[PDB]
């Protein structure tokens, strides 16, 4: 017996980041994941939040805890999730290697969307970005899989610490993370 009329992917799992900036607590971002529509991508992100898969194949934890927001661009997006080298050139999915683009059905229509960073077709790992504006030119190239449901103010604060090139002007860390 259906009862809702939703104009968006349904949120099926909720996760969070606790953010530190230059070593100080900056608040919590909460995310809703679109697990009915992109389950493999949603499940990857969820498991990296909890750390429950333990160690990956590259000698590093399959866990977002401690990873930085390494590229931060005002009026575009903020990007993080390098859990291997922790500097923006690495990352690892829970599936053992990069994984395929699951679906491009969900587009970059607005700010606050969670989407996979990549290095071309079918190269999803752990790195992600959060949009701060509509990014339609990224449609068909990046898999959207969730959205900010609380703490968009924190995303905007992070965004304000970036630069046009993306080099951050502060050290922004996922100090803790998990599933709600």
Residue numbers in the entry: 5 to 184
What does the paper say about this structure?
Previously, we reported that T. vaginalis cyclophilin 1 (TvCyp1), a cyclophilin type peptidyl-prolyl isomerase and homolog of hCyPA, plays important roles in regulating the nuclear translocation of Myb1 and Myb3 proteins and forms a homodimer in both crystal and solution states with the active site residues highly exposed. When adding TvCyP2, the cis/trans isomerization rate was enhanced so that new cross-peaks due to chemical exchange, such as cis-G54 CαH/trans-G54 CαH, were seen, which confirms that TvCyP2 is a catalytic enzyme and possesses PPIase activity. With the SEC-MALS experiment, the molecular weight of TvCyP2 was measured at ~20.01 kDa in a solution similar to theoretical molecular weight 20.947 kDa, TvCyP2 forms a monomer, which agrees well with most of the single-domain CyPs but not TvCyP1. The secondary structures of TvCyP2 contain 8 β-strands and 3 α-helices, β1: residues 16–24, β2: 29–36, β3: 74–77, β4: 81–83, β5: 116–120, β6: 131–135, β7: 148–154, β8: 175–184, α1: 43–53, α2: 140–142 and α3: 157–166 arranged in order of β1–β2–α1–β3–β4–β5–β6–β6–α2–β7–α3–β8.
Using the ARI crystallization robot, we performed crystal screenings of TvCyP2 under various conditions and found that four needle-shaped crystals gave good X-ray diffraction data, all belonging to the space group p2(1)2(1)2(1). A detailed analysis showed that these interactions include H-bonds formed by the N-terminal T7, R8, I10, and S11 with active site W141, R75, Q83, and N122 residues, respectively, and also by N-terminal S11 with Q131 of the S2 pocket. In addition, some hydrophobic contacts were observed: N-terminal A6 with active site F80, N-terminal V9 with active site M81, A121, F133, L142, and H146, and N-terminal P13 with S2 pocket Y93.
